[PDB]
């Protein structure tokens, strides 16, 4: 099985998982550790923002790849924002900071 682009999950916009569904392989925590074992940071940033989570970014990446530019704009993984809402639904005010 192999997946380029297809269905995306609703609560978090990560791609679906499975064969009967047009899903992609899960990049587990052990794989993240192995990538960090090398100095690969751009690889990780792509793998966890553009390929999977940042909805606006993964389209601008698609356009650049078709255009032959091969440059990504990571933005921010939507799942993290979901987490923030999930914590903000409690009595916790967690927020980003400028400085």
């Amino acid at each position: 099985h192999a997946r380029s682009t297809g269905s995306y999950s609703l609560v978090t916009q990560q791609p679906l998982g499975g064969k009967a569904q047009f899903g992609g392989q899960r990049f587990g925590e052990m794989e993240v550790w192995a990538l960090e074992a090398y100095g690969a940071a751009y690889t990780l940033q792509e793998m966890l923002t553009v390929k999977s989570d940042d909805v606006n970014g993964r389209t601008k990446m698609y356009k650049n790849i078709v255009d032959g530019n091969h440059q990504m704009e990571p933005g921010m993984p939507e799942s993290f924002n979901v987490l923030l809402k999930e914590i903000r639904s409690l009595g916790i005010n967690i927020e980003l900071e400028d400085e």
Partner: peptide, 17 residues
Amino acid sequence: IPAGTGYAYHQDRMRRR
């Protein structure tokens, strides 16, 4: 990440500051 090429970027950011 603050390691590898990410460390290079962060180090450049901190040195150019």
